[PDB]
Amino acid sequence: QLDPLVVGQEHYDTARGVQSILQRYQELKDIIAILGMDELSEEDKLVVARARKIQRFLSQPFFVAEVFTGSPGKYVSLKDTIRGFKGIMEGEYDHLPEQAFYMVGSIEEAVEKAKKL
Amino acid sequence: TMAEKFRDEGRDVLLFVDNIYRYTLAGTEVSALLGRMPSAVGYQPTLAEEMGVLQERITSTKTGSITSVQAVYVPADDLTDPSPATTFAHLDATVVLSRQIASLGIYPAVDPLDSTSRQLDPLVVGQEHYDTARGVQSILQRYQELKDIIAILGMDELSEEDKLVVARARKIQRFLSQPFFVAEVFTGSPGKYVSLKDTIRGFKGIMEGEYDHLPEQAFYMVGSIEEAVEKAKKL
Amino acid sequence: QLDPLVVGQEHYDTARGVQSILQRYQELKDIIAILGMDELSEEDKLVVARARKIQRFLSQPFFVAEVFTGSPGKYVSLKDTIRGFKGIMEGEYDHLPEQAFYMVGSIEEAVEKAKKL
Amino acid sequence: AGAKDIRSKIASVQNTQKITKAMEMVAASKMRKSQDRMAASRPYAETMRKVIGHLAHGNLEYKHPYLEDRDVKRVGYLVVSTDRGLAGGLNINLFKKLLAEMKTWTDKGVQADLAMIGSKGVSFFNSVGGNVVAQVTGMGDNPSLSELIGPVKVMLQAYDEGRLDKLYIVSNKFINTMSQVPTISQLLPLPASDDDDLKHKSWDYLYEPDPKALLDTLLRRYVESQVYQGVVENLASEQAARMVAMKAATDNGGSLIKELQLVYNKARQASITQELTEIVSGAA
Amino acid sequence: IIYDDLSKQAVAYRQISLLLRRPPGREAFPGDVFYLHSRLLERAARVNAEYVEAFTKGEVKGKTGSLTALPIIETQAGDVSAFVPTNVISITDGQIFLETNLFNAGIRPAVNPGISVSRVGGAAQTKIMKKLSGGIRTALAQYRELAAFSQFASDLDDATRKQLDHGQKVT
Amino acid sequence: TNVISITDGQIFLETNLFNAGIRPAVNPGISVSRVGGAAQTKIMKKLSGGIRTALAQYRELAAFSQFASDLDDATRKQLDHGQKVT
Amino acid sequence: TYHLDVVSAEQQMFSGLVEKIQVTGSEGELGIYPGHAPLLTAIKPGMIRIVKQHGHEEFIYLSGGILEVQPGNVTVLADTAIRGQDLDEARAMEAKRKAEEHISSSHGDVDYAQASAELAKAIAQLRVIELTKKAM
């Protein structure tokens, strides 16, 4: 079902952009291992930071996993999902730390978490 | 059996089997239909006898003879599979045709390095033929690696005796081409039938610097070598 | 029977050190196979040399194989072997060639055979 | 084991073979470039040595410390080493050749002082326990002279300050694409180069302002230049060693696919037999 | 004619054959799975004017008939060398091998050159296409390995730097 | 393949670890327990969370152990913490 | 004309026959015409003017170096970077620091980094030599 005519170009482009960011970050993990972080370009260091943030933002606390971890669950619509990943990839949330995305739920809660941090 | 009839007339016969592996597989299909238990890799229990009772009628005889040229397909690229291993027990010679040798415009595309026979012994073919063949084989398989050194470091690195091995190997590799009578309607040139002795002459020549002085395209598609010189003449 | 309580701590410790070196040597055989030996570290060329010595020193001439090789059989007591393998593992025989260990009895026969090269 | 594991190992050895073939081709192209950059550096040192010869032992002479021996109380080494692995035996042959002679020297009571080019020698001697006083690393295949001014400034400053008595450069010498040899060679005090000026009865220079201040800079620049030449030859030697080592590795992988395929075929046939026999003998 | 999965016909035949207790063969396919696809695909033929004339009893004389067939086969994990794929590869006159690594990367249709070939070849191709397209296939089959070697190599020789980007245009 | 499907966990003991000295030879990367933290005292539950991650990062990096002389120092520390915890 | 060579330690900056040049010497500005008698001097950082034969003038920038004139040949042994006393002492101090503080910088050969990492991953836990029965 993931083709433009059935999901729309917005959802399709968001999903393809996320995939391509994570693919590039996989290309780069093994350069980071050998040559270290400080050797990447200024363009690539941003791909690294956004890929890590995206990789965090995919996590989510389930309402039923509350028994394993205690943290309360979250339900996230599709609208907020796209508005979140689009916002990360467009460089709009570069001001936050990585862990402001981990197990957050919706993007509007990542800022509220980063303020606590 | 038609070939055996021709043999009884005292002739020399040539029997082509267009794929012996399909003979094996038809044997297996029928064996399964008759309900017999599967043997080594699913092959019929009687594989090496169904093969032998064919391959054993193809022999010379005090009256005539049958030679056989058999196309062979090896499953899973595995020369251990029971069918290849059962066939090779009967094959004397073995010629392999290479896509690459054809890519260079050399026909017939017989790979001289992997093609083999068990008639190549000084006992059977003589010492001169034997060592001429071994000579051209060693030349070709050295050229095989010099042509890699060339491709990675460029020609200029090679020693200057190797710059001559790489000139003799090219002439050998050309002289292995031939104009078939059947090939005219591709190549135009008339056909040539080369007596063995003449091939021994030509390669004994090229191998030992004789004909160093004439260009490599004088050997291509010529036939005998005493026509290589008369093709160089007009080159 | 290979327990600290049965064979004493020193025998057990030597047997396990030998197992560990030979295993570490097994794990390098593919790197050595593909890349050749000169890629190994200075601390993993030494492991390889010590393992290749321990391998030879495990060999012994048998009083019943004299029929096959003439070399007179040797009888090696236990103390005299848990001393020799301790010796090899701690590098105190690193100055010998591998062939000094092939088909000998106690460790002094190897330190002696080395003199003949 | 089982067919489906061995086929995966065959696939990964084939991948390894692709990688080593690529590294061979890359290393060969970089070798050609580096041995061009090597020959491009000859003219400067070639002409500066003729100038130094005419100025130091020509129709007359001036006398710099660097030109005349003195009793060796302690020695310096400029050690050139690669920055990258997979060079084969290159670095360790050199380091052992060095250690043998640093041992031979300290058998006569003299000390040694080390300065490191490249990080492999750094990691090595910082573990064997050498006395390392200046280092430069990460030049890679972009050796530049300005990055070398430091570690040689150290050794020269210590030489004319009296704390060294002899200075060596240890490096590989690129003879052929197929052979490389480690060499320890002297560069202070200046070795004799057969620069005899008997043709130069004919003239002497006009010096602006004076010949001694010029001779000082000439000698310093010459030492820097020869250190740079040593670095560039070590780099081309590294590249050639990597090319040959990766050629070897590709052949080692190709000659192991052939074993894995025999094992895989044996396993394939065994699986077919064991399955079909179970079916046929489980029926009835 | 198009057979959507000849690799599902073989499974239905294996079933209906085992349920009749008939002895099995390799990979538990019935003894004669080859004679199943062989006798099916050997109907796809071009037949000459004498045969059409005799069969149709003289009603049509100028024509030749044909029935071209495109069987489809599914391979597990690209393993072209499995028992039913290597059977059918041995019956047809070519194959178009659709590669998953190209399909995921967005090259659609994912025709893999080099591995895929047509054994009748240019005899079937229209003259203009035979002229223009003659060079393409090997050009791509080589660009696709040059683009592999291009991962480890920067600073490519500008002789190959042209071949890369041309192959990339055409791809 | 049956009893792996029936049970609530698996402890995989591997001989290539046993020989190398790691006794008990539990392989943490392929072992599983589905009851997980619910079957732990809360101190052990608190503490083992970081051990899982130390060993997971170590497994993701360990391919480089045989090249450690050239590794960046920022990863060398993870690759060595993994060894110390193993 | 006479033959001019401008060479650094690293590469050759200029060559060929010339009609005249004007250089800024350490003592003062200079100018070399053909046949100029032998001379040796330092030169300051700055431009150098060449007139290639047939009057084609062009300006080259040199960071320093030494000028050697022989009667019919001249060569300019230029330097790659500004060479002073306090400029070089900064380099010496940085090189001395990096040796005590073990600041081992990385190279920048990304191609070798990628190839080496792929080669390390591909060969990991292959266990090939245990699987095939090679003796070794």
mmCIF file of all heavy atoms in Angstrom, chain G residues 20-34:
data_model
loop_
_atom_site.group_PDB
_atom_site.id
_atom_site.type_symbol
_atom_site.label_atom_id
_atom_site.label_comp_id
_atom_site.label_asym_id
_atom_site.label_seq_id
_atom_site.Cartn_x
_atom_site.Cartn_y
_atom_site.Cartn_z
ATOM 1 N N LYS G 20 64.213 38.179 -18.817
ATOM 2 C CA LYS G 20 64.638 38.885 -17.619
ATOM 3 C C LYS G 20 63.670 38.559 -16.495
ATOM 4 O O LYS G 20 62.573 38.049 -16.727
ATOM 5 C CB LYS G 20 64.696 40.394 -17.848
ATOM 6 C CG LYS G 20 63.413 40.947 -18.402
ATOM 7 C CD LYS G 20 63.404 42.458 -18.463
ATOM 8 C CE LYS G 20 64.306 42.986 -19.559
ATOM 9 N NZ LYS G 20 63.668 42.949 -20.899
ATOM 10 N N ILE G 21 64.097 38.851 -15.266
ATOM 11 C CA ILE G 21 63.254 38.702 -14.090
ATOM 12 C C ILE G 21 63.635 39.782 -13.091
ATOM 13 O O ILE G 21 64.755 40.292 -13.092
ATOM 14 C CB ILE G 21 63.386 37.310 -13.442
ATOM 15 C CG1 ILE G 21 64.694 37.200 -12.663
ATOM 16 C CG2 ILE G 21 63.347 36.236 -14.499
ATOM 17 C CD1 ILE G 21 64.954 35.832 -12.121
ATOM 18 N N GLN G 22 62.686 40.122 -12.226
ATOM 19 C CA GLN G 22 62.918 41.069 -11.148
ATOM 20 C C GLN G 22 62.490 40.419 -9.847
ATOM 21 O O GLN G 22 61.365 39.925 -9.739
ATOM 22 C CB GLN G 22 62.143 42.367 -11.365
ATOM 23 C CG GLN G 22 62.205 43.343 -10.198
ATOM 24 C CD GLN G 22 61.035 44.299 -10.189
ATOM 25 O OE1 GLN G 22 60.453 44.599 -11.231
ATOM 26 N NE2 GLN G 22 60.670 44.771 -9.001
ATOM 27 N N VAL G 23 63.391 40.308 -8.880
ATOM 28 C CA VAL G 23 63.137 39.563 -7.620
ATOM 29 C C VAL G 23 63.366 40.523 -6.474
ATOM 30 O O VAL G 23 64.119 41.467 -6.677
ATOM 31 C CB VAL G 23 64.044 38.335 -7.500
ATOM 32 C CG1 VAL G 23 63.488 37.325 -6.514
ATOM 33 C CG2 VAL G 23 64.291 37.684 -8.850
ATOM 34 N N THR G 24 62.708 40.316 -5.345
ATOM 35 C CA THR G 24 62.924 41.135 -4.139
ATOM 36 C C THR G 24 63.930 40.407 -3.273
ATOM 37 O O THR G 24 63.544 39.442 -2.665
ATOM 38 C CB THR G 24 61.637 41.319 -3.349
ATOM 39 O OG1 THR G 24 61.985 41.958 -2.122
ATOM 40 C CG2 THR G 24 60.930 40.014 -3.058
ATOM 41 N N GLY G 25 65.173 40.843 -3.243
ATOM 42 C CA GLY G 25 66.224 40.166 -2.484
ATOM 43 C C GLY G 25 66.113 40.532 -1.038
ATOM 44 O O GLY G 25 65.337 41.432 -0.741
ATOM 45 N N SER G 26 66.811 39.820 -0.169
ATOM 46 C CA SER G 26 66.832 40.112 1.275
ATOM 47 C C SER G 26 67.464 41.472 1.472
ATOM 48 O O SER G 26 66.902 42.276 2.224
ATOM 49 C CB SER G 26 67.590 39.060 1.986
ATOM 50 O OG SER G 26 68.070 39.535 3.231
ATOM 51 N N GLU G 27 68.573 41.726 0.790
ATOM 52 C CA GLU G 27 69.271 43.028 0.879
ATOM 53 C C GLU G 27 68.444 44.127 0.219
ATOM 54 O O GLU G 27 68.258 45.164 0.862
ATOM 55 C CB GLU G 27 70.658 42.847 0.277
ATOM 56 C CG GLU G 27 71.489 41.864 1.075
ATOM 57 C CD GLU G 27 71.238 41.940 2.569
ATOM 58 O OE1 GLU G 27 71.519 42.997 3.161
ATOM 59 O OE2 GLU G 27 70.745 40.947 3.132
ATOM 60 N N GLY G 28 67.922 43.888 -0.980
ATOM 61 C CA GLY G 28 67.128 44.875 -1.723
ATOM 62 C C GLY G 28 66.476 44.227 -2.904
ATOM 63 O O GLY G 28 66.707 43.046 -3.079
ATOM 64 N N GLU G 29 65.727 44.969 -3.706
ATOM 65 C CA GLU G 29 65.127 44.451 -4.952
ATOM 66 C C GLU G 29 66.276 44.074 -5.860
ATOM 67 O O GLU G 29 67.354 44.358 -5.499
ATOM 68 C CB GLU G 29 64.369 45.534 -5.689
ATOM 69 C CG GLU G 29 63.076 45.061 -6.317
ATOM 70 C CD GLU G 29 62.030 44.634 -5.304
ATOM 71 O OE1 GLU G 29 62.303 44.756 -4.092
ATOM 72 O OE2 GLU G 29 60.947 44.182 -5.727
ATOM 73 N N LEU G 30 66.073 43.274 -6.884
ATOM 74 C CA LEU G 30 67.174 42.804 -7.749
ATOM 75 C C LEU G 30 66.648 42.852 -9.162
ATOM 76 O O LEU G 30 65.483 43.212 -9.336
ATOM 77 C CB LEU G 30 67.540 41.374 -7.360
ATOM 78 C CG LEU G 30 69.009 40.983 -7.486
ATOM 79 C CD1 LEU G 30 69.874 41.970 -6.738
ATOM 80 C CD2 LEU G 30 69.240 39.580 -6.957
ATOM 81 N N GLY G 31 67.480 42.528 -10.127
ATOM 82 C CA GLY G 31 67.034 42.224 -11.473
ATOM 83 C C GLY G 31 68.071 41.486 -12.290
ATOM 84 O O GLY G 31 69.199 41.961 -12.426
ATOM 85 N N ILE G 32 67.702 40.345 -12.864
ATOM 86 C CA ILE G 32 68.653 39.447 -13.510
ATOM 87 C C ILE G 32 68.446 39.491 -15.013
ATOM 88 O O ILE G 32 67.389 39.093 -15.513
ATOM 89 C CB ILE G 32 68.502 38.008 -13.000
ATOM 90 C CG1 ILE G 32 68.351 37.981 -11.486
ATOM 91 C CG2 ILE G 32 69.699 37.197 -13.420
ATOM 92 C CD1 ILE G 32 69.470 38.642 -10.750
ATOM 93 N N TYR G 33 69.455 39.936 -15.733
ATOM 94 C CA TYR G 33 69.496 39.854 -17.181
ATOM 95 C C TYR G 33 70.405 38.724 -17.605
ATOM 96 O O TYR G 33 71.202 38.216 -16.813
ATOM 97 C CB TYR G 33 69.984 41.174 -17.761
ATOM 98 C CG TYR G 33 68.910 42.222 -17.795
ATOM 99 C CD1 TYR G 33 68.398 42.747 -16.621
ATOM 100 C CD2 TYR G 33 68.410 42.691 -18.995
ATOM 101 C CE1 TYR G 33 67.421 43.705 -16.640
ATOM 102 C CE2 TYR G 33 67.435 43.649 -19.025
ATOM 103 C CZ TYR G 33 66.943 44.154 -17.842
ATOM 104 O OH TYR G 33 65.963 45.113 -17.852
ATOM 105 N N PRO G 34 70.326 38.296 -18.860
ATOM 106 C CA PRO G 34 71.163 37.179 -19.297
ATOM 107 C C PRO G 34 72.634 37.459 -19.059
ATOM 108 O O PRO G 34 73.083 38.604 -19.062
ATOM 109 C CB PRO G 34 70.847 37.058 -20.789
ATOM 110 C CG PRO G 34 69.519 37.698 -20.948
ATOM 111 C CD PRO G 34 69.471 38.798 -19.944
#
